[PDB]
Amino acid sequence: DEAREAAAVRALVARLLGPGPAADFSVSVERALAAKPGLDTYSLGGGGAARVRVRGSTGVAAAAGLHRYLRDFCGCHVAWSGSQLRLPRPLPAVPGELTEATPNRYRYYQNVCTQSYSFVWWDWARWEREIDWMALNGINLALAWSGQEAIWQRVYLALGLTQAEINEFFTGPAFLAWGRMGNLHTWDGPLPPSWHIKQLYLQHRVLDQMRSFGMTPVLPAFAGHVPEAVTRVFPQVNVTKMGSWGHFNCSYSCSFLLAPEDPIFPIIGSLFLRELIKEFGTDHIYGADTFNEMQPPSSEPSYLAAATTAVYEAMTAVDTEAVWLLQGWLFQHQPQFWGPAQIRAVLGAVPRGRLLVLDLFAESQPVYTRTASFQGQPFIWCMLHNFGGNHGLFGALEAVNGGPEAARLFPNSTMVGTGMAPEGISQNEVVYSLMAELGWRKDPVPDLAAWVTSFAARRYGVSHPDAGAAWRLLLRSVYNCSGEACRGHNRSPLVRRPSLQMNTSIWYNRSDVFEAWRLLLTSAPSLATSPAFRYDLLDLTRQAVQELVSLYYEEARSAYLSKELASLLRAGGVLAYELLPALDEVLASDSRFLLGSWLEQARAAAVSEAEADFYEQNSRYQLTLWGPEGNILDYANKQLAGLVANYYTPRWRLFLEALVDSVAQGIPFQQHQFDKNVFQLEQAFVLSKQRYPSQPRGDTVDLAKKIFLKYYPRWVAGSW
Ligand SMILES: *[C@@H]1O[C@H](CO)[C@@H](O[C@@H]2O[C@H](CO)[C@@H](O[C@@H]3O[C@H](CO)[C@@H](O)[C@H](O)[C@@H]3O)[C@H](O)[C@H]2NC(C)=O)[C@H](O)[C@H]1NC(C)=O
Ligand SMILES: *[C@@H]1O[C@H](CO)[C@@H](O[C@@H]2O[C@H](CO)[C@@H](O)[C@H](O)[C@H]2NC(C)=O)[C@H](O)[C@H]1NC(C)=O
Ligand SMILES: *[C@@H]1O[C@H](CO)[C@@H](O[C@@H]2O[C@H](CO)[C@@H](O)[C@H](O)[C@H]2NC(C)=O)[C@H](O)[C@H]1NC(C)=O
Ligand SMILES: *[C@@H]1O[C@H](CO)[C@@H](O)[C@H](O)[C@H]1NC(C)=O
Ligand SMILES: *[C@@H]1O[C@H](CO)[C@@H](O)[C@H](O)[C@H]1NC(C)=O
Ligand SMILES: *[C@@H]1O[C@H](CO)[C@@H](O)[C@H](O)[C@H]1NC(C)=O
Ligand SMILES: OC[C@@H](O)[C@H](O)[C@@H](O)CO
Ligand SMILES: OC[C@@H](O)[C@H](O)[C@@H](O)CO
């Protein structure tokens, strides 16, 4: 109720600022503050000689008001990487009563993938910080995906499956996103008993905390995928075996899909939802997806309607208030299958307003556009932005700034909210800061250059003219990809398998990055004490090294092709023996860029050495080979200390060496042979029991300065 929501926001203020400064805020929650039912509203008053009055129509609204006040009146900044929470004394006064309402019924957060790429090894402490970030960003709808395998285990045991069948079925922890969608099964499991104990524990705390703010946590439901062992206990079920996803064979993919009209369908679907709800309660919104990246066995509208009605009916068969949150990714991913009549069949099969669809990649491939606003079903306009959790400076900020407005103005628009659905978090914080803001604004931000200048100013605690100019440069270059082919996948040579056919082209002027780097480095004598400045300088230096690797690749390749041995040794030499080690070393100077920081999260999730080794191996697979044969090679690449020294660099050394051997003998370089040798090194990184440091070493500013002094003059002079 109102009181519990206000107490939740009061406790947020105390975690955020300390209990001392928290006493200067008067928080309340009052339903009547909203003019229109379900359009969240906050108001700010007071300050100066008086306490700061923050009122919300809900707990999330109040938290958004708090953020509004801290950002625009106090100059504060909150992000995944850290915060800048200096309060002026006295606290600034607000003129009269400032009251703002969102035009969005929902602000949504999380991809299904984010659960595996970023949240896998999170404990409660980390989730608690994330739910605060969510509340401050005004989020009222989000996935609560933890612990669902523990519920499926109860269901399957009750259906007569053996514990061994259940253990064989789930993937390892790092691959559960794809197990849950039916893309995968089995790969790199089993889930150990401690996993379920910890995830059930976690999920209860997540749900309690979300609900205390008045957030709506979305819960999973059955979408038709079942383990093969279901055909042992129910041997007359009608099932179709799906195709291979992600180049996995039938030991790991080729999922069994239960036919929509099989009598077992509502029985399994109902038993799962009932067990889920007994354990966790419900807020009446359920997520399910049958055909994410998997071609349905028929394009007949009548079949596709029945497959969709079967899932919705299983939900309403236990909860008559059910609303089904559906990912729209498939419509964009297999456009040749998903013609107008196929899409109309799914969208028409659930009553209007009971399908809430995520237009998941709306900043670049919106579907509302080509389906007359999902044939009248409500939708949430999502920015996807990031794939694989990849590091790399990227954004299409003009398209995100104008996107929600265009969706709202579209004829017969059924837009009911905005969302952020990155595959991984902990990158490109500027992009999420903007899209979160668009959650509450009526209009696009009018001047992006001034906005990014203020973003940097609040983040560093000072408006520096060089740092400001650096960010304006990044805004118009890396953060302004335009066109239909803008994807935030890092495909740079640094993170990919070396070859003679790598494409080094980009969507911006490379000089803008090197200038931005120079300008940000010039700011260091003022800003070096800001953890956020250190983070951004490191991220930008890292980007500059990524650019240099590409440029040195170009030189090495041209020299290979001309049989210029000395030039090839020189160019390939600085790439593999100087640039890459320099990168690893500078990354190693901050805890937020250590492979070892993430792997120690994995060890702390385990309860034994053996289990910890298993989780760490899971993590190393996920970042590199993905599957056992390099099935989705480098898709979840990252630029972390340890990973660059022991994975990216050995591949480049081997590649250079094979090129110089080729030029030195008579002999052409053969890709297929190098492909076999480099696979041994990639796999060795995965299977090694090497431990990686979780403590930083060296000074970030000093190391970045050395890289700049050495490589920047070579850039301006063209002399490699
Ligand atoms: C589906 O894919 C998996 C993973 O690639 C296959 O399992 C793998 O099978 C291979 C070949 O049998 C094993 O590799 C090695 O083969 C040599 C044979 O000369 C042997 O000396 C080594 O000890 C080793 O066994 C590999 O261990 C195994 N990998 C895993 C992760 O289990 C599987 O066979 C494929 N399934 C189908 C149905 O095709
Ligand atoms: C927006 O919605 C309305 C649905 O009411 C569509 O207009 C109806 O359909 C045709 C026009 O193409 C007319 O014969 C009906 O009489 C219209 N109804 C009304 C009340 O005007 C309209 O076409 C939709 N726009 C788009 C782009 O699909
Ligand atoms: C993002 O890119 C687009 C394309 O370069 C920019 O939009 C142009 O802005 C100029 C003014 O400088 C206008 O005269 C043009 O009409 C626009 N061009 C096109 C092709 O649309 C935009 O300024 C860039 N955004 C940022 C924030 O730097
Ligand atoms: C299985 O279900 C599909 C419809 O989903 C149907 O085409 C097929 O005839 C059914 N097969 C059997 C053996 O019942
Ligand atoms: C790299 O890709 C771009 C389009 O994305 C294309 O125009 C270009 O020709 C490609 N370069 C090479 C060398 O193949
Ligand atoms: C990129 O920046 C450099 C240096 O300011 C400039 O010489 C060049 O003409 C710029 N633009 C393009 C499209 O190359
Ligand atoms: O406006 C204040 C609210 O806290 C949020 O919606 C921000 O605008 C974006 O973080
Ligand atoms: O590539 C496998 C990834 O984990 C997913 O994000 C999707 O398959 C991308 O389309």
Residue in 50, 90, 47, 37 with CA at minimum distance from that of residue 68: 47
According to DSSP, residue 297 is labeled S
Distance (Å) from CA 143 to ligand 3 centroid:
36
Does ligand 7 lie within 6 Å of residue 56's CB atom? no
According to DSSP, residue 280 is labeled H
Helix, strand or coil, per DSSP, at residue 275: helix
Atom index in ligand 2 nearest the CA of residue 412 equals 1
Q: What's the CA gap between 662 and 169, in Å, rounded?
A: 47
Atom index in ligand 6 nearest the CA of residue 511 equals 2
Tell me the CATH number for domain 467-476+509-717: 1.20.120.670
Does ligand 8 lie within 6 Å of residue 613's CB atom? no
Neighbouring-strand partners of residue 53: 26, 45
Residue nearest to atom 3 of ligand 2 (CA): 412
Residue in 382, 445, 379, 441 with CA at minimum distance from that of residue 412: 379
Q: What's the CA gap between 456 and 57, in Å, rounded?
A: 31
> Which of left, alpha, beta for 616 (phi over 0: left; psi -120 to 50: alpha)?
alpha
SS (H, E, C) 557-598: HHHHHCCCHHHHHHHHHHHHHHHHHHHHHHHCCCHHHEHHHH
Q: What's the CA gap between 366 and 611, in Å, rounded?
A: 42
Neighbouring-strand partners of residue 382: 419
Work out whether strand 98-101 and strand 77-79 pair parallel, antiparallel, or are unpaired: unpaired
Q: What is the torsion angle, in degrees rounded to the nearest 10, for the CA atoms of residue 34, residue 36, residue 37 and residue 39? A: -70
E strands present in 228-308: 239-241, 256-258, 285-287
Does ligand 7 lie within 6 Å of residue 386's CB atom? no
Q: Phi, psi at residue 496, to the nearest 5°?
A: -110, 165
Resolution in A for the shown PDB structure? 2.3
Q: What are the CA-CA distances from residue 87 to residues 6, 17, 43, 186, 363 (Å)?
A: 22, 9, 20, 51, 35
- Contact yes or no for 559/650 (Cβ under 8 A): no
Atom index in ligand 7 nearest the CA of residue 102 equals 6
Work out whether strand 285-287 and strand 216-220 pair parallel, antiparallel, or are unpaired: parallel
Q: Which ligand is nearest to the CA of 513?
A: 6
Distance (Å) from CA 422 to ligand 8 centroid:
12
Q: What are the CA-CA distances from residue 53 to residues 16, 28, 47 (Å)?
A: 17, 8, 8
Does ligand 7 lie within 6 Å of residue 130's CB atom? no
Q: What does the block give as tokens for 116?
A: 């595996």
Residue in 145, 39, 155 with CA at minimum distance from that of residue 99: 39
Residue in 556, 553, 545 with CA at minimum distance from that of residue 513: 545
Residue nearest to atom 8 of ligand 4 (CA): 238
Outline which parts of the chain fall under CATH 3.30.379.10. 2-101
Q: What's the CA gap between 400 and 418, in Å, rounded?
A: 11
Q: What's the CA gap between 284 and 319, in Å, rounded?
A: 7
Q: What's the CA gap between 9 and 29, in Å, rounded?
A: 9
Residue in 157, 152, 198 with CA at minimum distance from that of residue 171: 152
Does ligand 1 lie within 6 Å of residue 249's CB atom? yes
Neighbouring-strand partners of residue 198: none
- Contact yes or no for 283/217 (Cβ under 8 A): yes
- Contact yes or no for 218/286 (Cβ under 8 A): yes
- Contact yes or no for 41/35 (Cβ under 8 A): yes
Neighbouring-strand partners of residue 55: 28, 43
Q: Phi, psi at residue 396, to the nearest 5°?
A: -120, 65
Q: What are the CA-CA distances from residue 382 to residues 232, 241, 435 (Å)?
A: 41, 32, 9
Residue nearest to atom 9 of ligand 6 (CA): 509
Q: What are the CA-CA distances from residue 629 to residues 175, 363, 447, 553 (Å)?
A: 15, 33, 48, 26
**Which H/E stretch holds residue 536?**
helix 531-561
Asked whether the CA dihedral 204, 206, 212, 218 is positive or negative, the reply is negative
- Contact yes or no for 475/88 (Cβ under 8 A): no
E strands present in 254-297: 256-258, 285-287
Distance (Å) from CA 381 to ligand 1 centroid:
44
Residue nearest to atom 2 of ligand 4 (CA): 259
Q: What's the CA gap between 361 and 452, in Å, rounded?
A: 23
Neighbouring-strand partners of residue 325: 287, 356
Residue nearest to atom 11 of ligand 5 (CA): 503
- Contact yes or no for 244/253 (Cβ under 8 A): yes
> Which of left, alpha, beta for 82 (phi over 0: left; psi -120 to 50: alpha)?
left
Distance (Å) from CA 242 to ligand 4 centroid:
15
Q: What's the CA gap between 90 and 68, in Å, rounded?
A: 18
Outline which parts of the chain fall under CATH 1.20.120.670. 467-476+509-717
Residue in 18, 84, 21, 8 with CA at minimum distance from that of residue 47: 21
Q: What's the CA gap between 122 and 115, in Å, rounded?
A: 10
Q: What are the CA-CA distances from residue 676 to residues 247, 440, 632, 679, 684 (Å)?
A: 18, 52, 16, 5, 13
Whether domain 2-101 has CATH 3.30.830.10: no
**Contacts of 558 by beta carbon, 8 Å cutoff, 6+ apart:** 564
Q: What's the CA gap between 649 and 640, in Å, rounded?
A: 12
Residue in 495, 488, 539, 506 with CA at minimum distance from that of residue 386: 488
SS (H, E, C) 115-184: HHHCCCCCCHHHHHHHHHHHHHCCCCEEECCCCHHHHHHHHHHHHCCCHHHHHHHCCCHHHHHHHHCCCC
Does ligand 2 lie within 6 Å of residue 372's CB atom? yes
Tell me the CATH number for domain 144-350: 3.20.20.80
Q: What does the block give as tokens for 500?
A: 């003679």
- Contact yes or no for 401/448 (Cβ under 8 A): yes
Distance (Å) from CA 123 to ligand 8 centroid:
25
